[PDB]
Amino acid sequence: HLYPGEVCPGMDIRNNLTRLHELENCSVIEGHLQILLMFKTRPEDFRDLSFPKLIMITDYLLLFRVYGLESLKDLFPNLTVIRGSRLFFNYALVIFEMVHLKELGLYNLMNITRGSVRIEKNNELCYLATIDWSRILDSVEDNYIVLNKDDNEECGDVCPGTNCPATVINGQFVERCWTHSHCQKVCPTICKSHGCTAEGLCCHKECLGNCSEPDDPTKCVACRNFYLDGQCVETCPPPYYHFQDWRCVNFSFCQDLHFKCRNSRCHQYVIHNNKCIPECPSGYTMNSSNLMCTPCLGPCPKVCQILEGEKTIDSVTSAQELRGCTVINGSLIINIRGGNNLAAELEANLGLIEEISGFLKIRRSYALVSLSFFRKLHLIRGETLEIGNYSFYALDNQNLRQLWDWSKHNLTITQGKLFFHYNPKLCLSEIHKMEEVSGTKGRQERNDIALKTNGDQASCENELLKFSFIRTSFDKILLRWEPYWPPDFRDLLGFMLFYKEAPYQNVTEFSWTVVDIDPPQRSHPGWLMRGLKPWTQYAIFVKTLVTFSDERRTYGAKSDIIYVQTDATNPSVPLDPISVSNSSSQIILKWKPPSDPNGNITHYLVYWERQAEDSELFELDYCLKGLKLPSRCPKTDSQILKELEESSFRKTFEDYLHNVVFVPRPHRPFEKVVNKESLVISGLRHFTGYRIELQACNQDSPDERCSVAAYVSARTMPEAKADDIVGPVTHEIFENNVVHLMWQEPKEPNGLIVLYEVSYRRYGDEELHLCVSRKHFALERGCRLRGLSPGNYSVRVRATSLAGNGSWTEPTYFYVTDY
Amino acid sequence: HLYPGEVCPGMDIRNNLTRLHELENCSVIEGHLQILLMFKTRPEDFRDLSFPKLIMITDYLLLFRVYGLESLKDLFPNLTVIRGSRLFFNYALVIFEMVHLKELGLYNLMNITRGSVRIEKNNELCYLATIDWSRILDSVEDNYIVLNKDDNEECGDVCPGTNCPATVINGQFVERCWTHSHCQKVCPTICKSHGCTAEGLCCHKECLGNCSEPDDPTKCVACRNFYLDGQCVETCPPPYYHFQDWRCVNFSFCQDLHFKCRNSRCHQYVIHNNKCIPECPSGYTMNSSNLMCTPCLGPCPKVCQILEGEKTIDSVTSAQELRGCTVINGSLIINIRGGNNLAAELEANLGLIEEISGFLKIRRSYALVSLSFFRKLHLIRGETLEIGNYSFYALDNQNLRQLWDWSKHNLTITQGKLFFHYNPKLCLSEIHKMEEVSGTKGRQERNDIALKTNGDQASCENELLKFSFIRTSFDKILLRWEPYWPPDFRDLLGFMLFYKEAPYQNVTEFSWTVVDIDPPQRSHPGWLMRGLKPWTQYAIFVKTLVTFSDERRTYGAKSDIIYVQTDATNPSVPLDPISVSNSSSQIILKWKPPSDPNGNITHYLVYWERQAEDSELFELDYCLKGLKLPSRCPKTDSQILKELEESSFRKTFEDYLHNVVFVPRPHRPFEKVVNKESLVISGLRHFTGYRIELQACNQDSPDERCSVAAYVSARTMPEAKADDIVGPVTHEIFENNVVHLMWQEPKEPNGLIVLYEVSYRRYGDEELHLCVSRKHFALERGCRLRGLSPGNYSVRVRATSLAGNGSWTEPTYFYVTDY
Amino acid sequence: GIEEQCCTSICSLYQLENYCN
Amino acid sequence: GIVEQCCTSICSRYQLENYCN
Amino acid sequence: GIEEQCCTSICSLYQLENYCN
Amino acid sequence: GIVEQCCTSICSRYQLENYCN
Amino acid sequence: VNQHLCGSHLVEALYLVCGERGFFY
Amino acid sequence: VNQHLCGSHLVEALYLVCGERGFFYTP
Amino acid sequence: VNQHLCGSHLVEALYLVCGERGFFY
Amino acid sequence: VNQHLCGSHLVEALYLVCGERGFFYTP
Known part of the structure; x- marks a missing residue:
């Protein structure tokens, strides 16, 4: 059922298995569990060691270089929930450099409330692709499972199918199994997170993971919200207070924890908002007799003294140490070497601070898209500046686009200069707006805010080019936009046209076939499109190409992406x-x-x-004889530099000439x-x-x-009796015993008849054949026999057409005179 | 002949033709001629105005926006030499924005000693491609002739060919003519520069351009070296001194020039090295009575006070103002917005200076490949620094590769910090060597010397990778190089292999098909080549791919370009x-x-x-019947950033884990x-x-x-009489008048004979034919005739083979009995 | 000569209105 | 020079009179 | 299984010495 | 941390003893 | 695809650029 | 009329501003 | 030209990488 | 033996330096 026995606060085990035997009597760990750095260990040192009592871990589980351990199915056969209250580098389950480990075996792990899972450098660990982490962890995209045996080699993963459930992962259904004998238990969608029983029945509304009897809070294994008297409850009833976000305790226990710290070396607990929290938040102060936080008669913030006056924020666990802070007595360095957006968990821990006594530095923050997680950041005192007298150091942020929403956000930098370098997606407009808002406009010196690196990959030309004359034809599109001229009209080296076919409307900004367009002569600049496919919609927008200016703003002009579809025409051949x-x-x-x-x-x-x-x-x-009738290359980089340099050289010569010459004197x-x-x-x-x-x-x-x-x-197919001859066989016998045979031709044959054959045989004699062609049949009106021996014959006639050979006619008997 | 009349020192004419009338009496211009800014002028204002007396111009000729002028063939019909002693922005002939000008017409221009020619923005000027500038100007590659009518339109260029010489320009021969009636005079190669006469005879050795009578110095038109008494001489004999590098004068003339300046407002001339030079060079001082420069008894340099303490060098004329300087009392800004290497003329004017009292700045110098033109630059005092406290400001130099040859060159920077940014071909090794030599090692602060912009396009990995195992096969090459590891072996993200087929040995460095190679597991890394063409030589070298480091040097390793040729094999089908x-x-x-x-x-x-x-x-x-016998793409930058970031993230997690876990306790x-x-x-x-x-x-x-x-x-072809029948025609007559014909077959026919034909005709009757096939001929041993009328016949026999029809045999006569 | 200028080369828009009234 | 006055900065009508007789 | 690993994919040098004595 | 001491800087034999019992 | 215009392509291109004011060809 | 004047437009601006009296060049 | 190895290409590749020590295939 | 120690090589360096007595973790 629920958690029995001790609570065993967070512990660390090292160098041997001797000290791990103190986990025997506790079921839930009120902290973090770390088994790591075990080299003098053997695979036979873990078979007899098992902890079926362990159920839930509050902070995280870490495993780092324990030799001889092959599976966790024996160490933790009943671990089901990792709450992730405190993470280890934004991870709740870390398995790093587990040599000799072959399978996970955590066949009861149901929910990981907060954090992620990292599995790395396990050369023998398998059965990883057969785990549906989406059923265990909410944010599965933050997991990092690389460098294992599942991809380096082809180790088999045998999930018994004759029972392991199969769930779709990318586009295919695969069975889920922790080990070769344990299937990953999957509950129906009706049981969202409360879990199911063996027969598939939803547990109580306040349950989590697994339960013995459904619809009973007292028969669960892991409480979803809080634990109290072997029962899961949504909230702690009086006079019980929340504690560690997972269980309810009375005032006596929190007082004892508070007194155990006051009268000793610490987390001196207090009471606030029906909770036993470690440190009371801003605006409240602990009293003498009672521990409840009364509001103060004055605005006292929560100062957070940073050791060495410099803190580096690189993960969720580093930011969580500043949770609840309002004034920071130090300097913040924000460096998330990542790839996953941590702003969700960063705004929860940060964003409650108003003042920074030192400098704020954002360096190599690849994953950050904005600094908006600083919800209440107002003052940067800069009492301790970055080397070079800097109070806001932004550098090498590959995805930083927005600093703050200046419509409603206030910022005030007291001392220190600014610094912005290599922010390819942060444009100068935001930098200058922040300079104006902060009040440090006349404080920065040259090369403190870069120009060729800030916003060089972001389209912020902040000036609109309006197309003026568009019309379409068979395979050409005519484009005309209003002429644009910088104050130095010679700085305009020409326009650049980007086009790309788009079946649907909403298309990205910034394929993209490019053509260079010269500036006009001072006649709208325009351009004619060629090589198009009919009845196709294209995305069109023009971006200007102006010479760089080191002193002032470079310049900018671009057009909204318009969509034009070419006309229809005649289709192709079927x-x-x-x-x-x-x-x-x-x-x-x-x-x-x-x-x-x-x-x-x-x-x-x-x-x-x-x-x-x-x-x-x-x-x-x-x-x-011979009667066989057929039976029917982007612009290279140094090149564009040449045009740039030549265009600048022409202007340089023009300026030199002008300066020298002009002297300011004082039917089918x-x-x-x-x-x-x-x-x-x-x-x-x-x-x-x-x-x-x-x-x-x-x-x-x-x-x-x-x-x-x-x-x-x-x-077409031929008819059956089309070639067959109809009509009686008519014959005539002359004085000289000449037999003239006549028969009606097949008026409607299969196309045409080429020949006829007559087979006359005297009784007792052999069969005699004679071919009658079209011309013979026309000339003789049938057949004519000359020089025949006396006797009685049998005459059969057949017709041959393009289709083939027709059936013979009925036998006909004639007798020639013997004389 | 030689120059008569006045000398008319350099003059400028503006706004009208009124002041041009003072050019009438002078043949040589001792300075520069500028005709420009004439708007209220008409084409009829130039026909009656001509200057046939003008011969040569010392400095340059400039033409800028003179309206109504259509050709120079009337203004300067005898201009032959432009010495280019003083240029106008490294140009000796400038024609800029000449509206209404259609042809050059300078049909006597023979030599331009120093400088170049710029022709720009002349919408009507033609006959430009019909000029062989190589015969006129030595360094023709520095000319800039763009934006004219010769390329914008197709204006005709008619050079009379029925006499204008034709010279090859690129790959074709084209006639040379200044105008429609004047051919560009070209002299034989025996007349190198002295010029030829009308009949093609070389002038004197001291001549230039043209001459009246060959082999006579006194009959020339333009002196090559010096002018004296109507004679061209190599050197000025005593007591004459050189003056303005083109003529010889006595001491009285230079003294009068000196006194005209001393007793008035200037170029106070002196005498040195048998020359009347304006200002004496370093180490000499003018005396009281005589003007000859005695050497000083002390090292006095020629200081050059720069106005406003800041000079910009952007052309040959700007550098020439510092000619002869040794100590500069100001700051130099070197900015040649160019494309042509000016180091040749830059080392002549510069390179004689030792000290710079201010800062030295090199900005946007596209054409410079090295700063080696500073031959004697030793000290940069930096008493006046660039904004930001800089004494050596190098920026945006697209081709700067070498600063100085540090083996023999000394440099000492007294004050000021360094600055190096966006020098894609200048590597950090040169920068650090200059830091060590100058003595300003511990003077620069972070971001003063950039890392991802200095040398990012130059291969200076300064560590050698040695191939260890190479062997070749049919279409594969096996490569093995010794493993390389940075101190942080995780920084090595892999190797990159560059290969390209090369018919010959010497190939460029830094096509170039790329394949990414993973680092080995710690087995040499190596790689197997596939998809090769047999018997072909390839260029192979490996360049490492290491993670960037912002703090220290990034890292470097690359291999020399080795050349391997694959083996030969069976060729293709002919x-x-x-x-x-x-x-x-x-x-x-x-x-x-x-x-x-x-x-x-x-x-x-x-x-x-x-x-x-x-x-x-x-x-x-x-x-x-039926006897027809035949008569026989680089992975998008987006992806590579992802692998870079993931590789860095793995190392970041490793470092966090290691820091957390380990605690430093105090036959055919x-x-x-x-x-x-x-x-x-x-x-x-x-x-x-x-x-x-x-x-x-x-x-x-x-x-x-x-x-x-x-x-x-x-x-093969057939023989003539192969099908013809040989042998006598033999016949037999039986009792029943049966004619049995016999004839010898053509033993060796053209392949085979298919039939024979016998033509027997009774006298007075008609011809009778009978075909005898192979089987008939074999069975009857020829022919057999049955039932023939009495009379005498004529028998001819022919044979038909695969080749065709043979000739008939001779007629044979037989007579059958009448009974 | 439109043929000689952009049947072997490429003619942009600017040099095409010159063939218009 | 006139370029730095006019093309980079802004010239007025009176300023251009300095470049005339 | 060399076929299944680099007849439809690409096998580098390292996973080829594993098929050697 | 141990990383900044050893991977970036240089650690001696005595320094690594501080990370042991 | 993207190549020079010759013949019918040229005549359609000129009809596209002009024809409201008129072109002679 | 007040704007940036560069190059050819600068020359035209000078010509419209003055030119009845002419440009100035030092003696 | 730069595609996977299948069959004779594989056997030649393996003979290239190894064969001095020996490969079984 | 004196060199840079990073990651796995760092772990092996610690294991060779000590491990008969074991790694240290705060009480």
Whole structure:
């Protein structure tokens, strides 16, 4: 159930396992736990050592170079909550340089309330990618898990699937398991943070992590808000006071803690706002008999004496030592060598201070985007200045954009000069505004505020260029902006045009194809766009190119990013035209839409034409041998320096000349396709070739504006009995026993018939064949037999067309006279 | 001839043509001529005004905004020499903003001794590209001729070619002409500078430009060295002294010039080294009676009091005002906004000074490569410092590489701090050496000498990386260099490899394909090259990538550029194989060498094989119908910052952890081709198809190492009478008048004979034909005629082969019995 | 000569209105 | 010089009279 | 598994000596 | 801290004894 | 893509720049 | 009219300011 | 040209890195 | 042996210097 036994305040264990045996009788650690620096240790020194009683840790857990430890599943088999009240360099779980460690094994870790997890330099640690930290820690983007065995090698991670839950991480579902035999317990979304039981039932509203029986505060394992009498409560009822943000205590316990410090060497506890806090905040003073903080009859701030008069803020834990401070009796150095935005936890610890007796220095703060976390910073006395007599030292801040919101924020620097160098995203406008507000305008000397490094990567030209004449064509865009001239019009070396296609409106500022535009002659400067793609929206804005000025402000002018879309036109040719004739009169034609729509495609045009049969087939003798009828580079850097130098040299010569000279004396079938890519075609002749003309056309009513077609050919299937001969077989016998055979031709064949074959066989004799071609059939009106032996024959006739061979006609019997 | 009349010292003319009339009586201008600022002038105000007497100008000629002037061919039709003793901003001929000027017309300008020519902003001036300035001015690379009509428009330049000499300028020959009627006079190379006459004869050795009669000093027009009594002399004979470096004068004239200054308001002339110089140099003093400079009995320097204690050097004319100075009582600002190296003329005027009472400032000196022109600069007193207490202010020098040669040069800065910023090619080694030599080591404060701007574009890693294991293969190169470690080994973020193919040895330093190489684990770091082209030499060197350090020196390590050439291999396939049979037994085969030699190609292999005649031609009946026999990108700066920041963050966490934890307690026919790309082939059958196997092979004796072949086919020409039938025509007549014809077959035809045709015609009747195929000829042993009418016939026989139709045999007569 | 000036080279806007009324 | 007076600073009508006869 | 590690990715020199005696 | 003493400056054998029992 | 204008490209470019006032070509 | 005057515009400003009397150059 | 190694490229690369001491593949 | 000691090498330097007696941490 809840926490039994002792409380074992924060402890550190080193150099052996001898002193760790004092964690046996306590379940919750009221502080931080550190197991580190164990070299004379062996893997057999941890099997018999286990701490099932430990449940929750308040500050953090640190593990640094403990040899022989392979898994935490035995040391802490029931650790479930790390509150993270006090972090170790903005981290709540640090595992650093754990040699011989192979798996985490913290299979009960459910919630990490505050902080992050860092795992680094563990050459044998695996089962790291199989942990869903999003279910454990809220802000998972701040975790730093690098240089392990999960990426250096390919160590296997076997989560039993025949039960470990699978959750999506990036784009795939993977099973979650701490070890080879323990699955990461995942609760349903109905149990937000209170946890679930074995059967998946939500615990009490005041619960956290795990519980024995659902919907019962007294059967939980880790309290979400506070602990009291084995029960989790939202707030401490009277006469109990909050203590360490995790449990409720009476006045006697806090008094004993206070007296144990007063009568000894410390955190002399007091009472304020129904809490037993270490030090009373600003504006209150502890009394003699009672410990409750009465408000003072005077504005007494909380001074925080910084040792050595210089404090470096580099993490959440360093800033937290200034929590509740109002006046700082020292100097602050803000250096977050990071990559994750800590302003959320920085404004909670800082931002309550008003005065700084020394200097404020912000150096190499990569992650900071603004100094707005100083909510109440008003006075910088500068009684102790940075070397070189500086009271505000900003340097090498790669993402600093805003110093303060000067509309409502007041600032007053008493002494010391300013310094701003290598702030690529902090512009001179903010610096000068802060100079005016602070009152140190006439205090800085040259090169204290840099010019080629402050804001060199930020667009703050603070002057608007207005486009004056824009119109678009097929593949060109015409641009015209109002002319711009600095006071020295020769300083304008020309304009620079940035363009980029954008499907949607909101586009970033500052790809980005560049073209250099000369200044006009003193006619708007303008420029003509070329090499565009039709029906595409582009982002356009112009940024001036002025010569640098070391003395005064350099200069600035730029235009808002306008969006222009070029017009539509005829699309491309439809792709992949394929035609298939599944039936004797039906053809299915399939195609792909053109790759260049150049607008919205509205309709398609398909044309057909029956191909006339080749003339030579009607005038070829195919009974002869040989009768095989077919069965149908950015501008390099030194270069631009050359134009810069030449343009400056021309002005230098002009100025020298002017100074010297002047002395101041004293029809075919078709159809319309609607949003379809195929068609079934009716009314087609059987076994005939067709020519298809296919177009994709995006405009019908206001005249068609569309391109050339795609051509393809297809042949329909033939009929069954098209080639078969119909009609009775008619024969004539002359005086000289000449047999003249006649038969009705197949009026409607599959295209055309090339030849006929007649098979006459006298009874008992062998079959005789004779080919009759088109010309023979026309000349003889069928067949003519000369010189035949007496007897009775059997005559069968077949017709051969383009489709193939037709069926033979019924046998016919004729008898020639014997004489 | 030589110069007559007056000398008219340098004059300036403005606002009208009224004061130009004093140039009428003088031929030489002893100074500078400036015609400028004439707005109320018309083109008709210059036709009647000419100065044919003017010959040469000592200092320079300047022309600035004179309206109505279209050509100088009338103003100065005899100007020939501009000595350039005193320049106008390192220029000897300045033509600036000449509106209405169309052509130069200075058709006698031969030599410009010193300076350059600037022509700018002349919207109508043409005939500029038709001038060979190399024949006029020595250092032509310093000319600045931009923004004229020669490039803005296409104004014609007609030089009469039917006489203007043509000289090569870049890669083409173009005629030279000042105007449409005047050719630029060019002398032969035998006349180096003395000039030539009309017929092309060299003038005297002491002559210059032009002369009337060759080999006569007294008939010249412009003296090369000095002028005296209408004669050009190398040196002034006694008792004459040099004056203004162009003429010789007696002591009386220089005394009168000296007395005209002493007894009036100046250039109080003296005598020194047989010269009448304005001011005597250091170590000499003028006497009372005589003007000769006696050496002083003491080291008195020539101090040069600079007005306002600050002088800006920006051109040759500004530096020339300090000529002969030894101690400067002021401050020098060196700012040559240029692009041309002026060190040659800067060391002549400067470099004679030893002390500078103020500060020395070098700002925006683009063209300077070194400060070595200060030959004798020893002391910089710094009695008047630059704002911010600076005595040596170097800033924004884009090409400054060397300050001084510290092996022999001494320097001593008395007061003032140092300053070095934005010198991309000046490295910290030179700065620190100068700090040590000058004695101001413990005088500079932080940010006075920058780190990320000084030498950021120069390779001065001043530590050698030695390659340890190099070996090459087909297309891979293996590289291994000795491991390098800074004192903080975590600062080494990895190595960077630069490679580039180089046909020849000497290659530039600092293309250059880059690959990032991780540091090793503490095994030499090394790297394996992939994607190479065989038999190619590459330039290899490795430059380390270390984390920046703001406090101390950053760090450095790089390797000398080594050169490795990969091995040779089999070449590519020979290209374009074409075979032509010009003769019945000869075939010429032509090919191109392979595009990938991969070494030196030694020999070629060509193979042949006779293709057997197709079998079906021997078993085809070609007498039937159907007898048609054929008649055979750098990772974006954004990413690299991310790796830099992450690498620094890991070290920051490591340092925080270490500080927290540790507490300091108190066989087929072939042939071999030798360097040839074609072959004539003998011993070939007539009219036969051959298959060709062609190889290019670069190794013969130590086993052939070469690739696959290219295949092509060719057919030889046929013989004339190969298809003709030889042998007598033999016939037999049977009892039934059956004619059996026999004829000997053409044993050796063009491949094979497909058929024979026999033409028998009875006398008075018509010709009868009968085709005899191969099988018919074999079966009947020729021809067999059955059922022939009585009479006498004429029989001719022809043979048809693959080549074509053979000639008919001689007629043969046979008579069949009539019975 | 528009062809000789920007069929082998590139002509900007400024030298294009010169061909206008 | 006139440049430092006029192009960098601001010249008035009276100041330009110093550069005339 | 050399194939799975640098036939679809790039393997540097260091993880190639690990396949050696 | 130990880092500023050892990694930036130079530590001796005696100095490292202060970080031991 | 981004290259010189020749022929029809030139005539469309000139029609783009001018044509309200008129161009002769 | 009051503005910065540089280069050619400076020359035109001087010419409009004076030029009926002419520019000055030292004797 | 600068892509991963697969097959013969890998075997030549391994023969380049090692083979004096020996590699099994 | 005298050199810069950073990170892991620093930890090994401490372990070789002492460790028979153990590291020190404040009570």
